[PDB]
Amino acid sequence: VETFAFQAEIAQLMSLIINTFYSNKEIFLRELISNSSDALDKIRYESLTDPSKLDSGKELHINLIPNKQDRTLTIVDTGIGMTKADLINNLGTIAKSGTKAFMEALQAGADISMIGQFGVGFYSAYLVAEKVTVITKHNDDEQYAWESSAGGSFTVRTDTGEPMGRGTKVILHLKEDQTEYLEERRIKEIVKKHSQFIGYPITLFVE
Ligand SMILES: Nc1nc2c3ccc(NCCO)cc3nc(Cc3ccc4c(c3)OCO4)n2n1
């Protein structure tokens, strides 16, 4: 279990997301599905010059798994996955320039629903989650669990859970006031309104 500090900018974005009054929380779901869609484009893309990159699983899709018992909503994709270096270095680099641009727009008229246009939509998960655990597997690397409850830090460990093949699970530990996002009907309403044209199948699991 290693512990790392976020860069100043990302930490500050994360507190803004957590502390600002903003009632339209539901946009988190569009952002994570859109992240999954991008990760699926990326695996489909690299496999064009190396078809063996699909040995770890051919199917390209997304599952939404609510669990009232654990109070979690998990978004699962078989996209390209993230390496250790992504989790500790590259994602932070991407998040730095994206945060700055998002900040500039926010003070000049924009709102939190436009976060995905700046490449930092993942952090919108913190509108509804007190803790996010991300389990990720990339092709020539091991399986990792990343985890953060914000407050300026995150952890990374080699994951010993069930091996997952290739891709990412984002596990959202929902705040107590946000269990609406565990309801089939709420989720289905949200997918229909904001995520109806994704180029990969999306399956909504029932409890
Ligand atoms: N499902 C999925 N797949 C990817 C993903 C897959 C590949 C990738 N490549 C990074 C450049 O090598 C970046 C990615 N970024 C995100 C967004 C993301 C951004 C920040 C994150 C995070 C995920 O988990 C922990 O912190 N996702 N989300």
Partnered with residue 171 across adjacent β-strands are: 74, 133
Tokens of 186: 């709420």
Using CA positions, which residue lies closest to atom 8 of ligand 1?
82
DSSP label at residue 88: I
User: How deeply is 92 buried, as exposed, middle or buried, from its count of CB atoms within 10 A (0-12, 13-18, 19+)?
Assistant: middle
φ and ψ at 63, to 5 degrees?
-120, 145
Q: Residue 141 — left, alpha, or beta (φ > 0 → left; ψ -120 to 50 → alpha)?
A: beta
CA distance 2 to 12: 22
Name residues contacting ligand 1 (CB within 6 A). Answer: 35-36, 39, 42, 77, 79-80, 82, 86, 90-91, 122, 134, 146, 168
- For CA atoms 105, 133, 160, 201, the dihedral sign is negative
Q: 125: CA distance to ligand 1 center in Å?
A: 13
When divided into structural domains, the chain yields a total of: 1
CA distance 199 to 189: 19
Q: Residue 35 is part of which domain span?
A: 1-207
The contacts of residue 88 (CB under 8 Å, 6+ apart) are: 4, 156
Q: 132: CA distance to ligand 1 center in Å?
A: 13
CA-168 nearest atom, ligand 1: 1
Residue 188 marked in a binding site: no
Q: Residue for token digits 């957590």?
A: 18
Secondary structure of 174-191 as H, E, C letters: ECHHHHHHHCHHHHHHHH
CATH number at 103 reads 3.30.565.10
Tokens of 108: 């000049």
User: How deeply is 136 buried, as exposed, middle or buried, from its count of CB atoms within 10 A (0-12, 13-18, 19+)?
Assistant: buried
Q: What angle do CA 197, 179, 158 make, to 5 degrees?
A: 75
CA distance 112 to 132: 19
The contacts of residue 179 (CB under 8 Å, 6+ apart) are: 68, 71
